[PDB]
Amino acid sequence: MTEYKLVVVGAGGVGKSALTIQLIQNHFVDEYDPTIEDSYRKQVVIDGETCLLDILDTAGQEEYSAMRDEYMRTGEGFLCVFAINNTKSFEDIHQYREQIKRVKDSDDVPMVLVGNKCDLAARTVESRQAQDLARSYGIPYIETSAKTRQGVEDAFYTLVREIRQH
Ligand SMILES: Nc1nc2c(ncn2[C@@H]2O[C@H](COP(=O)(O)OP(=O)(O)NP(=O)(O)O)[C@@H](O)[C@H]2O)c(=O)[nH]1
Numbered sequence: 001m002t003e004y005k006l007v008v009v010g011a012g013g014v015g016k017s018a019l020t021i022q023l024i025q026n027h028f029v030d031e032y033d034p035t036i037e038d039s040y041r042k043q044v045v046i047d048g049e050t051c052l053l054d055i056l057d058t059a060g061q062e063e064y065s066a067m068r069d070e071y072m073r074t075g076e077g078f079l080c081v082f083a084i085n086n087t088k089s090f091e092d093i094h095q096y097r098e099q100i101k102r103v104k105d106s107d108d109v110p111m112v113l114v115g116n117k118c119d120l121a122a123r124t125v126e127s128r129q130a131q132d133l134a135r136s137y138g139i140p141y142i143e144t145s146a147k148t149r150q151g152v153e154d155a156f157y158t159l160v161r162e163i164r165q166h
């Protein structure tokens with residue numbers, strides 16, 4: 001089968017782990033345990049193709065971010081995650097994209113911009129603002145909620161479909 005190595009990056013607390021665990025294990029992690037570097041593997045059929053997904057869940061907390069660049073280096077596609085109720089996390093996306101470019105030594109790496117926590121109403125990043133950022137990078141924007149499952153499969157499968165175009 002075909003293997004896709006996906007890496008999930010973004011600021012601390014935006015929901016990278018909750019998204020990944022919802023996809024892989026079908027439950028919502030309510031507590032906040034900061035991640036160092038975790039890996040998940042799942043065989044899934046995506047558009048009629050049996051896929052092996054290797055998903056790297058990375059640290060967003062600066063204190064835990066040692067060697068994150070060495071993990072990111074291995075990725076074939078990246079979910080760049082911010083939270084729609086965390087303006088700073090959205091502003092931080094620029095720096096994650098720059099890090100991705102640096103570690104892949106490429107200007108056109110498969111990526112999807114993900115606005116997570118879309119179940120929450122304290123929105124400070126409007127959809128149009130994120131759409132514009134994604135457009136500037138030439139990538140899709142998708143909103144998700146790790147809590148309700150909204151958009152979760154769509155985000156990860158869209159990333160696979162982006163890898164397939166490159
Ligand atoms: N309402 C809501 N809460 C969410 C959502 N995603 C994550 N959370 C909550 O936000 C907190 C942080 O989630 P977590 O997945 O640990 O974030 P992270 O990006 O992996 N953090 P780190 O970078 O430190 O590893 C948790 O309390 C989690 O339940 C979401 O879509 N909706």
Ligand SMILES: [Ca+2]
Nearest residue numbers: 027028029030
């Ligand atoms: Ca739970």
Ligand SMILES: [Ca+2]
Nearest residue numbers: 102103104105
């Ligand atoms: Ca480099």
Ligand SMILES: [Ca+2]
Nearest residue numbers: 137138139140
């Ligand atoms: Ca593109």
Ligand SMILES: [Mg+2]
Nearest residue numbers: 016017034035
């Ligand atoms: Mg985490």
Ligand SMILES: [Mg+2]
Nearest residue numbers: 124125126129
């Ligand atoms: Mg505003």
